[PDB]
């Protein structure tokens, strides 16, 4: 049969274009505390979360840094990017100097990585605790995953601006159309059950049905990994996270 569309979208000519990206949004790696001014809060194509253009002026040069905008950023805000700066909203500092229970965002995964986690709209990471021996901070990710990360990792205080975008329903197909055209998603999505067998494992005959269990193994071949790819369970949840995970 032909190559399914899942494998066929993995080819690198289907990725979003690089010219839509305003710039890489990394927390600056600084020796001393860096004082910046939020120069502009800009929009990026596809990204609902806005970006914060941070202009840093020294004696020598002007550095132009880029961060994802925090809810409460404003143009002209003095931001401080350092190791032990104040823990106001908009600053970026190492997690050891961040008190527990404060929602941070653009958290680095490795130290001086530039910020990886909680980068899209409304996301934040709750700093749960500090292991001051072994230099380890346990943090709560927006998926609910409790993640260990080293206290040398930086993070920006606050939640990601761009708020509750999931609350608004797309009423029309056009609003899904222009959304996916901006983000570069593959849309509209034909159900594989509506396809022919040459197109899809769900591609069937005479009645639109799957025909075999749609829970596939995680060791499956690519081309078989279609539907629910490592499903621990299925069906409607109806329970707490505790009752379903175990």
């Amino acid at each position: 049969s032909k190559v399914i569309r899942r494998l066929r979208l993995l080819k690198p000519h289907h990725r979003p274009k690089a010219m839509w990206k305003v710039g890489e949004t990394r927390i600056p790696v600084v020796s001393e505390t860096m004082h910046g001014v939020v120069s502009e809060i800009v929009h990026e194509r596809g990204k609902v979360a806005p970006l914060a253009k941070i202009r840093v002026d020294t004696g020598k040069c002007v550095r132009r840094e880029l961060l994802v905008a925090v809810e409460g950023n404003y143009v002209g805000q003095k931001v401080e990017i350092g190791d032990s700066v104040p823990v106001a909203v908009g600053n970026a500092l190492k997690l050891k100097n961040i008190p527990e229970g404060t929602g941070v965002c653009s958290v680095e995964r490795r130290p001086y990585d530039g910020g990886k986690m909680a980068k899209s709209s409304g996301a934040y990471v709750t700093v749960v605790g500090h292991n001051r021996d072994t230099n380890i901070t346990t943090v709560r990710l927006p998926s609910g995953e409790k993640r260990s990360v080293s206290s040398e990792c930086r993070a920006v205080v606050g939640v990601i601006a761009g708020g509750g975008v999931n609350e608004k329903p797309l009423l029309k197909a056009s609003r899904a159309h222009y959304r996916a055209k901006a983000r570069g998603l593959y849309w509209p999505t034909v159900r594989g059950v509506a396809m022919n067998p040459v197109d899809h494992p769900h591609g069937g005959g005479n009645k639109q049905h799957i025909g075999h269990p749609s829970t596939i193994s995680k060791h499956a071949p690519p081309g078989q990994k279609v539907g629910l790819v490592a499903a621990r369970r299925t069906g409607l949840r109806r329970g707490s996270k505790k009752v379903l995970n175990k």
Partner: protein
């Protein structure tokens, strides 16, 4: 990418200096990375007797 260009600068990896004009820069870097590795290994008495 600017972070990666800083990343290949922090590590001093001679395999990053892959262009032709970087050749004399690369073999200077190879000479010092060999020298740090040569003396961090346990030099056997057959080689180390020439250090005396």
């Amino acid at each position: 990418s600017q972070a990666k260009r800083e990343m290949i600068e922090r590590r001093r990896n001679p395999r990053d200096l892959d262009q032709k004009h970087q050749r004399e820069e690369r073999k200077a870097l190879i000479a010092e990375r060999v020298h740090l590795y040569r003396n961090a290994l346990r030099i056997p008495p057959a080689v180390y007797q020439f250090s005396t």
